[PDB]
Design a protein around this ligand. Structure first.
Ligand SMILES: O=c1ccn([C@@H]2O[C@H](CO)[C@@H](O)[C@H]2O)c(=O)[nH]1
Ligand SMILES: O=c1ccn([C@@H]2O[C@H](CO)[C@@H](O)[C@H]2O)c(=O)[nH]1
Lengths: 342, 342
């Protein structure tokens, strides 16, 4: 029969980081396809925060003393340590971890050993690379992959045949972007001025607008799981040049020599050189084939329809393999009073 | 006859960064060996700042309207842009740049072209690597090397045969030190507890004390010119494990496979493994030969006597090759009024 299970995704703030938005996308796909998924808003139950969740995202407020069903599932971030310690206070529920930031695993958990000994049913990740990284850290829990998607509003528009536009972000490696720009100013001896635009405090729709009009995206990616902004750029028809976000580049099989002009750590000269090459490919009308390769990568592997199919497959596979509750029956009510937030 | 030249080293604050202290060491060596060198304190002429210069460092206060001799030399940092723009207001004096931070060249100067066109006589650097880096950026000015020294108070003391002590710094790569420690906690399955000590807000003499008593220095060096803290560790008899500070490691010929257990960017697993190996070399009394190699490197190449000889050689070579003044005679007085500081 039906599972009678709801998946709860904890929040404590306005959705802000990429990971937050991906979680809302899991919720939407789950509810669209016959599951039940909700935000549990742990704290900061105030207008700006409440109103920040679109109306199609069900929200339940945490209040000490509220009840859930013993069979319900919490889908925890790798961050927020207090959710793990809180849920240790009961043998009810199940726990899934959606680890979207493998290098920030330390914020939630002290070691691989603590993860391995916790009652985690499955770790969902954004990429095959993430699975390998968590395994390298010594985590032995079962893992799954659901790759985020790039919204359809990321797509090429008209790019100026007169003015070449380079976009970048200072979200990561801000100091290194200054080093790079010094090398670029120093090595570039072409006659049209460089037009550089910073996409740092923009909303995602506005990022898409800017990328759609830009020729080149200079990548300052760092310790990525997948590399959303480089995929966004590719989806927008930008030539991506710079850091891949993967020191151990061989451990990911998304980015390759044919879809970007990637450099290794500290290769500022080569980065600047490849930017100049990318400008000249435009000026001399000798386009990089990497643009089309990138477009095809995103359109094949990172759009919404496939994402929804993977959400359904992965979460259904979890439901199908839960063991019976121990020490509870189905739809026993369990009091949640494990947190008291300032 | 005598040059009748003084070298002026601008300061605006308490000596703080390594580079500041190296400059005081140039001043001391110059005055010890028959030259004239002084701090010019540009601003912040207040007790805490004035008293922060040891009594053997001559200090002259900048006051708009003061006079210097037309032949005098300014030894500018690669930073502080205002010193370059100020000194552009006169054809008097000469300029040497002591570039101790090649990746921060952008703070003082916009491009290689601006450096190449400025009236810089010579760029003094801390390392052969720095020269190569500045050249790769397209700077064509003549260069020299004066390697800083490690004070004699960095030397081995008694290290506990019972408790193994790992030191590190969070000055650079703070987030990565947390990633590393997660890997170390996760992979280490030896029985004595790890003893980790952070040397971040310590005075240099206190760093030396701690290193003298520590078995291992875990290096979080980043975009170094030379790598002072790794040399300090080596001088103290510590086994150095971790990041070298040089992505383009082949462009420096100080650190090598025989004087440290170096890893490449993102190699947290190997870093943690090498830390465990270093612990076990102590526990099983199978010491790394890298310790002795490091000691010999520092004692041969990075102590004070050689430093003083290089100061004298390099600065004398500059004096010997200055062209006659244009538009001034020797010991004409020039008014300095180019700055007005808040
Ligand atoms: O100004 C910006 C820069 C980045 N991002 C988003 O941040 C995510 C990367 O973590 C991507 O989805 C990217 O569009 C924004 O929304 N706005
Ligand atoms: O607490 C600390 C850490 C580092 N340093 C010094 O910072 C320099 C590296 O830039 C080295 O000389 C090192 O001893 C200190 O003085 N104190």
């Amino acid at each position: 029969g039906p599972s009678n299970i709801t998946f709860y995704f904890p929040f404590g703030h306005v959705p802000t980081y990429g990971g937050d938005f991906v979680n809302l996308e899991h919720i939407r796909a789950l509810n669209k396809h016959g599951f039940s998924a909700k935000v549990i808003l742990m704290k900061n139950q105030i207008p700006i925060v409440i109103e920040s969740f679109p109306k199609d995202i069900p929200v339940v407020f945490y209040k000490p003393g509220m009840e859930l069903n013993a069979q319900d599932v919490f889908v925890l971030s790798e961050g927020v340590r207090i959710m793990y310690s809180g849920l240790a206070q009961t043998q009810a529920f199940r726990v899934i971890v959606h680890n979207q930031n493998p290098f920030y695993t330390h914020t939630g958990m002290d070691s691989a050993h603590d993860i391995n000994r916790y009652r985690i049913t499955k770790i969902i990740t954004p990429s095959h690379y993430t699975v390998k990284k968590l395994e390298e850290m010594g985590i032995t829990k079962p893992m799954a992959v659901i790759s985020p998607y790039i919204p359809e509003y990321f797509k090429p528009a008209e790019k100026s045949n007169e003015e070449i536009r380079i976009t970048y972000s200072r979200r990561k490696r801000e100091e290194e972007s200054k080093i790079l720009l010094f090398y670029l100013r120093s090595l570039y001896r072409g006659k049209k001025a460089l037009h550089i635009r910073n996409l740092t405090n923009y909303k995602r729709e506005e990022v898409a607008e800017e990328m759609s009009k830009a020729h080149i995206y200079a990548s300052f990616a760092e310790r990525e799981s997948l590399g959303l902004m480089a995929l966004e750029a590719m989806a927008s028809g930008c030539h991506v040049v710079g850091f891949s976000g993967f020191t151990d580049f061989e451990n990911q099989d998304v980015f390759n020599e044919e879809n970007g002009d990637w450099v290794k750590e500290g290769e500022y000269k080569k980065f600047a050189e490849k930017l100049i090459e990318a400008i000249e490919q435009i000026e001399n009308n000798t386009p990089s084939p990497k643009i089309e390769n990138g477009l095809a990568l995103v359109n094949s592997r990172f759009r919404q329809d496939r994402f929804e199919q993977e959400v359904v497959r992965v979460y259904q596979d979890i439901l199908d393999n839960l063991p019976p509750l121990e020490g509870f029956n189905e739809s026993d009510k369990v009091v949640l009073d494990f947190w008291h937030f300032d």
